[PDB]
Amino acid sequence: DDSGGFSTTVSTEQNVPDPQVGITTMRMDVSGVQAPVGAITTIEDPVLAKKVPETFPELKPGESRHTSDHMSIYKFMGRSHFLCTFTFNSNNKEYTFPITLSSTSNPPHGLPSTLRWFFNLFQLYRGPLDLTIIITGATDVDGMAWFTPVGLAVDTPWVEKESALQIDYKTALGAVRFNTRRTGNIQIRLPWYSYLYAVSGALDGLGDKTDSTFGLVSIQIANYNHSDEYLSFSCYLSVTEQSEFYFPRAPLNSNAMLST
């Protein structure tokens, strides 16, 4: 070893990612006519736990009959999943919600359902995301959205209040400007701007407030005459192909998965 360490025992890697494909394919019989040498093992030894388990005689299970592989991550999580929903009760107000991978946050403020589940599977997340917002109710409403990286000045999150900032500071971060008459939906990629290597989803206390926040999407609406009906927004996150997932963790216990 480089560090100066020695040993007689053979050092062997444990829990290698992606051993097999999650679709049935051929790449005769699997096991048979020999013996189940693979049916007795010592699970404590990492050299002997990589022994291909085989017990009875079996056949190769053909090919799976659909094309795509649904156990890939960039497919499964490619489908955009629910994040939040909120409603403006008055004109000329702003609303700011973070994208916070932390699990200490319990919904409605936090990640719900599958996102809360997925970002706790692994330790580190690095890369861009795709975000889609969907608008309901009132029409003829212009609105602006802008993405604020962490550490930079931003209004109190998860709170609906009148803007504290300049139109100049807002537009500098980049902004879409939409009208709920014409579009009724938006889909926009969020950049990865961080002074951090990645953003971990499972953390506590001090490190939880900084390292776990991806960034804060804000939405401001003007020209909302409340003689009209309600104005509802909803947000759905998906994962690009430039995101990367590192170092699998243990999945959440059934009491920690909430829903909205």
């Binding site: 013996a35 189940p36 049916a39 007795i40 017990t55 009875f56 005689p57």
Partner: protein
């Protein structure tokens, strides 16, 4: 230095579906050997899956009568369900296995005297007849029993079903339904025998079997 031999402790034995993991184990002791007989006590073919499970069986025995009207159903059969029975030697294969996929071959036999006249259609209907027309039975695999021409029909059909295999203990729905309709009525003069006997012979083709199981029912 010399090495003195010793027992090999850990070994794994077994046969078909079963397995034995022993810490203390030891080599097996054969005697004799398999012999072939110069003079065969039984010359018939030694039994196997294909001799027992696939042979012909008498499923149903009915009678086609002059008082059956047109489109009367002479015999309605759930074919596979009748093949699963204590009487038939296919049972001992099916009783211990959970799932099976297989073909079916039907032979239906009447015996009209040439002084009678009439017809029959015998069709293999997957699932149930449901609704659709009786006139149109010729769509299904079938054969037409005609008192003038043939007294024997034969039918061969693959496995048609919505799943992988037909679970015998708790069957979802019958795979095949055999229906015998009066295609044109039976007619006689005076004194001619007033009926015909009708019998059905069914068997499996290309029988596969899965899921050994202790469940007795």
């Amino acid at each position: 230095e010399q090495m003195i031999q010793s027992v090999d402790r850990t070994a794994v034995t077994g046969a078909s579906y079963f397995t034995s993991v022993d810490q203390s184990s030891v080599h097996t002791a054969e005697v004799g050997s398999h012999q072939i007989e110069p003079l065969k006590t039984s010359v018939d073919k030694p039994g196997s899956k294909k001799t027992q499970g696939e042979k012909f069986f008498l499923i149903h025995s009915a009678r086609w009568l002059t008082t059956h009207a047109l489109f009367h159903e002479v015999a309605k059969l759930d074919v596979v369900k009748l093949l699963y029975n204590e009487q038939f030697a296919v049972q001992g294969l099916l009783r211990y296995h959970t799932y099976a996929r297989f073909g079916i071959e039907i032979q239906v036999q009447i015996n009209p005297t040439p002084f009678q006249q009439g017809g029959l259609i015998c069709a293999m209907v997957p699932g149930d007849q449901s609704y659709g027309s009786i006139a149109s039975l010729t769509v299904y695999p079938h054969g037409l029993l005609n008192c003038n021409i043939n007294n024997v029909v034969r039918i061969k059909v693959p496995f048609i079903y919505t799943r992988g295999a037909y679970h015998f203990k708790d069957p979802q729905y019958p795979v095949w339904e055999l229906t015998i309709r009066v295609w044109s009525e039976l007619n006689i003069g005076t004194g001619t025998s007033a009926y015909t006997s009708l019998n059905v012979l069914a068997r499996f083709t290309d029988l596969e079997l899965h899921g050994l199981t202790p469940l007795s029912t």
